[PDB]
Structures are given as structure tokens and as C-alpha cells.
């Protein structure tokens, strides 16, 4: 066993009844003085390194050609001047195993952390040396972290796409279904997770040109998509991951759910395609009143009204659907469907739950379209217009397929540096650059939506780490007050940066004029309610930083009205799975699953303590499963009130609790304004 592995395992060997956390630090030293420094490839100077990486097809020469070599040297020197040290063995291990650039045979390390950060910063700046240095200081301080696609692939010749998630709308036609399969394979080839809205597809037993009981429903398309994602599996490196979203009022909703039952037959079971359920407020109202509900056949509704079932408001059209004899429907028990959802989530963590009305009551771009589904991580909530893919030799009507670039603020590092504004603006600029340089030649709706919406996702990580390292319980009202203030600041500065970009470029996102940003409605709660901390401890935490007041929000509203906004969507809190290790941060705004996690790599086992875990903050690092899910819902709703898109909200459940407890948590989340629920992980 390696020396650093032994040093890392020495953490759990208690000395005087206490964990040896400091041993972890020793491990990193070993991991660098025995493996990383020996396996790294050193050159005489930076010029030889850059030339070797350029000619050997490791780096794209275009982004490096925008800078003179003196500027690149200055950027690299700025990166290395911080003398960044990984505080834990797992941070360095995760970076150098998942994100550091290696040779073709993967026998040596070509990129250090500073080298990777410098390359990403140079790609972000697009020829601006000072902006490149700003990005270097932002990332080496670990205030901001580009998503895994962006961080891993920026400036690389053999790179994939920098966009993490893609959302596709599938129209009710064989041509559209085949095009959706093709686009899903193309985007999984690019490495991104693909989510498809199957609510427009007509249910099983519908008519295909006057011959009835002919359609296979959404389950056949689900099987096709599952096979497509199995085939396109990132060249066999990462398993192809897809998501299917269906409205709960679709007739196939049961069969949909039956795809995830552990007793499902092979002709129905789907195993590589995640499932999500979109629940309007009408379904929750029907379940609450115990009135038997009706699931609908989408094609009959489309024939009668000319619009898809998910294209209009069910809260106002459900009674018309039920009373219309030309609309076909089936009777269901909404409470039984809710119990089935809870049972399925207990068994397998599926489906994702999207509370459609919670998303669309604060959605700023309802004029473009209502949010009808979410992404594979159930945090992207954007307007999408379905595409009309016609026959060959016929022009296709290209709609809008959602796609946003992810980037997470490290809350602990951002607040320690007292740089919410600067970090938010620089992250917004980097995400705008990632969107601008993204061009997908096989997904037309994705390309058009990227060009028009200009949507970005600016997330946050290390919420629980910051709270525990500052002596604040994650479930405490003080933690929710901190989240309220911090994310109001993040939203304020993201809106300010979006408006500044719109002013400097003279262009807003498409159809901005009909948005609530243009009408000033979006700023209502910000121009009447003060989001400054209500607790003295939180206010002290925010000292040295100008917390925006109602007057600052009014000025920002006037600025947006004058100049507009460049981005339709700005903030989305992704799970941030593996890149949180490199940043020494807790995953997303979720509470920690465990204080020390035991992970098996190769034939060895390693223990990763939570960042900053110690004796004095052991009980502040409360495990998520031991927490009250209602208070976690309260925290997520408090954050969500300042996030325009959704938050990947994973439920952490105990084995003792029943499906009724899961249903109660889901209904409280819906009551509190939670937009989406990601996973039901049971301990």
C-alpha cells in the first residue's frame, strides 16, 4: 500500500479518543512527494511545455494564440504565486485522477492544478491578460469553480463540450422521435447529460392516422432512448445518462413509473434513463381533496384544442378536459399516484419531482414558454419551445431546447474573501464566454436556444461547510438567514452583471421585452422586502461587504429597464458531485451525507473527512440523514426564492420512515415553493 494511503487511513485510528484529522494533511504531502512530483512532466520553461502541449494535440492553439507568450507566462506566474496547497489528500487525488491532463498513455501528469487553472483562465479571458489574471486569482483562491465539463475540457484539443446538461423537447411524431434519439446520441457523444420531455408524445392506445390503439406510448420511446443512451456512452468511459420527463396528467404516467419498478419486465424496464415527473398544482389539489383525478390522452387534446396538453395551464384547463367528450381520459386516484411516487422513490430514488406551478409562478420568461420539465439533475428550469422536425427535403421548424453552462461559487471562500460581487460578476462573465464559444452542429434547437436565450447556470457549493465551520447549524434559522442574504446578494450581482453585459454588447436575450425583468415585476419582492440578515451573527459574517438594500434593488431595476438583461437565466444550483472534492467543499447547498466518507479506489480504501471537520465543529457537521427534512426544505426554499432556475434538492431519508413520510416531505416542499426534488437517498 502507498505511504499516502496509510497516512490517510491513519485518520480513523483514534488517538486519545479523537480522530487524527491532521494526518490527512500529511497524506497530501506524501501524495505529492512520492507520486505527483515524480509522475509530473517538467520542462525547461513554460515555452517548451506550451509547445509540447500544442503540437501533440493536447491544447487548442487558437485560444493560446490570442496572448503573447509574455502574457501567458504572467498568467501562469500569477497562478503559481498563490502557492496553492491541497488541504486534503482526496482533493488532490480527485483533481489528478479526474481533471489533471495526462499523456496519451496516461502514464504521466502534464497539468498541475495551477496549469489547469491558468489554461481555463486564458480560455475564459479570450485575449485579455488582466481578465485572465482575474480568473486565475478567482480560481486559485477557489472562490469560483467552473463545472466539470468546463474545468476539464477548456483549452483542450481532445475536449468534448463545455455544456453539462441538455434539455430536449420531443414533438408527437415519428420524425421528431427519431430526431430526438439522434440528438440524444450526439449530445451523449459530446459528454453531456440529455433530458427529454415526453409529455407531448401521445399515450399508449392512441391513433396514428385514423387507425386506433396503435401507439406504443411513451414507454416505447423510453426504450428507444434507453438503447440510444446505452450506445452513446462517451466512448465507453462514462455510462450514457439520460432523463425522461413526463407530466403527471399524461395517461402513460403509471407505465412511465412502471419503468423504474424493481419487478418490471424486461420489455418495460428501463435502466440507464432517469425518470422525472412534472406535477402541476392541480394534481396536488386533487390529491389533497381526495377527488379522483383524470389522466389524459395528449393526442385527443391536441386534436380538440390545437395545442399540446403540457403547452397550456392544467389549473385552468383540467375541468374543460374532463367535461369535453372529445378528449379521452382515464380515471386515477391522485393519492394512490402520490403513494406510488413515494414508494418508487424509496425503492430507487426515482422519479424526479418537478412542481410545475412552483416553477412557473416565479418564472421570468413565461411569455416565451412555461417550464414543462427539468434536466438530468433536476435543477435547470427554463422555457423551451418544441421543434417541428419534418420529413426529409422539408424545412424543419427549429424550436428552443434548453442548455446552460454550470459554474459554482465556493461560499466559504467567497465569504472569506468578502468578494460576493467580484466573484459573481467574474463567474457570470466566464459562463457567458462558455455559452458564446459553444456551437453544437448536430442539435439545432440546442444551438438556437444557446444563441438566443444566452442562459447560464451559476451555482454555489460549500454552504454546509461554511455554516459548520462558522458554528451555525444547517437547520437553524440563522443558517436560513445567511442563505437568504447570501443568495439575494448573488442574485443582485448576477442581475447587475447581466445588465452590464447587455449594455456593453447592446443586445439582450431573445424575447426579453416580454419577460418580468423588462416589466419590473421580477424585482417586486426585492423593492419591497429587505433581505439583510436578521441575526447579529450573520450580519457580522457579512461585515466588510455592502449588502444590497431596497434602494440598491430599485436602482438595479431601473438599470435593467434601461439596458435589459443579457441572460434569460443566470442561477442554477447543480449537484456539483466530483468537482466539490477539488475545491475542498461540501457538495452543492445540500447538507453533508456523512462526516467522513469511506471510498474504495483500486484495491485500497480512503477516508475523506468533510472540509474543516474537527472536534469543535463535529456536531455542526450534522449528517443529512439525521436532519429534519422539513428544515432542509425550508433552507432550499429560502435559497430558491433567489434562484431563477431550480436547485438539485436531494432528499435524505432514514430506513425507518415510511412512504407517508416521503409524501409529507414532498407536499411540504410543494407548499414551501420548492421547484424540483432530485433524489430520495435512503440510508
Amino acid at each position: 500500500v502507498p505511504k499516502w494511503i496509510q497516512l490517510n487511513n491513519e485518520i480513523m485510528i483514534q488517538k486519545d479518543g479523537k480522530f487524527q484529522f491532521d494526518k490527512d494533511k500529511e497524506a497530501v504531502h506524501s501524495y505529492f512527494v512520492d507520486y505527483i512530483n515524480q509522475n509530473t512532466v517538467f520542462f525547461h520553461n513554460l515555452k517548451e511545455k506550451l509547445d509540447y502541449l500544442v503540437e501533440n494535440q493536447y491544447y487548442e492553439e487558437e485560444f493560446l494564440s490570442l496572448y503573447s507568450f509574455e502574457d501567458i507566462k504572467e498568467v501562469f506566474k500569477t497562478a503559481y504565486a498563490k502557492k496553492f496547497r491541497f488541504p486534503s489528500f482526496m482533493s488532490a487525488f480527485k483533481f489528478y485522477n479526474d481533471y489533471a491532463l495526462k499523456t496519451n498513455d496516461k502514464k504521466k501528469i502534464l497539468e498541475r492544478y495551477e496549469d489547469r487553472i491558468s489554461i481555463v483562465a486564458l480560455f475564459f479571458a479570450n485575449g485579455d491578460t488582466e481578465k485572465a489574471k482575474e480568473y486565475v486569482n478567482l480560481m486559485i483562491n477557489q472562490e469560483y469553480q467552473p463545472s466539470t465539463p468546463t474545468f476539464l475540457n477548456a483549452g483542450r484539443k481532445r475536449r468534448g463540450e463545455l455544456v453539462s446538461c441538455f434539455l430536449l423537447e420531443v414533438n408527437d411524431s415519428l420524425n421528431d422521435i427519431s430526431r430526438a434519439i439522434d440528438i440524444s446520441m450526439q449530445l451523449s457523444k459530446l459528454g453531456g447529460g440529455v433530458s427529454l420531455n415526453l409529455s407531448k408524445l401521445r399515450a399508449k392506445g392512441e391513433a396514428i392516422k385514423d387507425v386506433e390503439n396503435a401507439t406504443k406510448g411513451v414507454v416505447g420511446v423510453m426504450k428507444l432512448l434507453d438503447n440510444a443512451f446505452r450506445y452513446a456512452d462517451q466512448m465507453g468511459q462514462r455510462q450514457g445518462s439520460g432523463a425522461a420527463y413526463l407530466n403527471i396528467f399524461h395517461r402513460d404516467i403509471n407505465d412511465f413509473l412502471d419503468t423504474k419498478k424493481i419487478s418490471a419486465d424486461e420489455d418495460v424496464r428501463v435502466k440507464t434513463l432517469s425518470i422525472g415527473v412534472v406535477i402541476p398544482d392541480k394534481f396536488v389539489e386533487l390529491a389533497r381533496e381526495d377527488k379522483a383525478a383524470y389522466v389524459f390522452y395528449p393526442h385527443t387534446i391536441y386534436k380538440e384544442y390545437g395545442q399540446h396538453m403540457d403547452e397550456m395551464d392544467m389549473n385552468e384547463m383540467y375541468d374543460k378536459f374532463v367535461d369535453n367528450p372529445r378528449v379521452k381520459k382515464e380515471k386515477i386516484n391522485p393519492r394512490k399516484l402520490l403513494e406510488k411516487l413515494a414508494m418508487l422513490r424509496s425503492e430507487s430514488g426515482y422519479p424526479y419531482i418537478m412542481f410545475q406551478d412552483n416553477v412557473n409562478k416565479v418564472h421570468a420568461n413565461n411569455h416565451i414558454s412555461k417550464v414543462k420539465f427539468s434536466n438530468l439533475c433536476s435543477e435547470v428550469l427554463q422555457a423551451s419551445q418544441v421543434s417541428s422536425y419534418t420529413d426529409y427535403d422539408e424545412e424543419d421548424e427549429i424550436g428552443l431546447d434548453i442548455s446552460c453552462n454550470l459554474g459554482s461559487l465556493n461560499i466559504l471562500n467567497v465569504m472569506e474573501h468578502k468578494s460576493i460581487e467580484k466573484t459573481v460578476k467574474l463567474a457570470t462573465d466566464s459562463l457567458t464566454h462558455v455559452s458564446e464559444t459553444t456551437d453544437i452542429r448536430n442539435a439545432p434547437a440546442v444551438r438556437r436556444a444557446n444563441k438566443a436565450m444566452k442562459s447560464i447556470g451559476l451555482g454555489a457549493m460549500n454552504l454546509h461547510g461554511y455554516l459548520a465551520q462558522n458554528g451555525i447549524a444547517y437547520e437553524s434559522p440563522e443558517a436560513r438567514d445567511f442563505a437568504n442574504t447570501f443568495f439575494m446578494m448573488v442574485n443582485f450581482y448576477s442581475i447587475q452583471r447581466s445588465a452590464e453585459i447587455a449594455k456593453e454588447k447592446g443586445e439582450t436575450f431573445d424575447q426579453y421585452e416580454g419577460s418580468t425583468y423588462a416589466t419590473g415585476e421580477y424585482f417586486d419582492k426585492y423593492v419591497s422586502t429587505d433581505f439583510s440578515p436578521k441575526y447579529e451573527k450573520i450580519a457580522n459574517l457579512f461585515e466588510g461587504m455592502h449588502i444590497p438594500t431596497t434602494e440598491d434593488w430599485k436602482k438595479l431595476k431601473a438599470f435593467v429597464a434601461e439596458h435589459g438583461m443579457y441572460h434569460s437565466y443566470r442561477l442554477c444550483i447543480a449537484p456539483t458531485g466530483s468537482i466539490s472534492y477539488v475545491q475542498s467543499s461540501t457538495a452543492s447547498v445540500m447538507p453533508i451525507m456523512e462526516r467522513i466518507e469511506e471510498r474504495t479506489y483500486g484495491n485500497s480504501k480512503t477516508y475523506y473527512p468533510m472540509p474543516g471537520l474537527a472536534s469543535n465543529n463535529w456536531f455542526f457537521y450534522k449528517e443529512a440523514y439525521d436532519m429534519d427534512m422539513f428544515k432542509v426544505v425550508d433552507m432550499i426554499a429560502t435559497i430558491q426564492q433567489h434562484i431563477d432556475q431550480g436547485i438539485s434538492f436531494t432528499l435524505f431519508l432514514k430506513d425507518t420512515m415510511t412512504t407517508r413520510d416521503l409524501n409529507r416531505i414532498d407536499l411540504y416542499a410543494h407548499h414551501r415553493g420548492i421547484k424540483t426534488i432530485y433524489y430520495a437517498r435512503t440510508k
Binding site: L338, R660, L667
Partner: peptide, 14 residues
């Protein structure tokens, strides 16, 4: 397989 417990109403109100 978590224990299936029916919704008892008043679970929709908070």
C-alpha cells in the same frame, strides 16, 4: 421496500 403507509389527510396542510 419502505413500509407503505397511506396518506391520512392533513398531510396536505401545514
Amino acid at each position: 421496500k419502505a413500509t407503505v403507509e397511506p396518506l391520512k389527510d392533513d398531510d396536505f396542510y401545514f
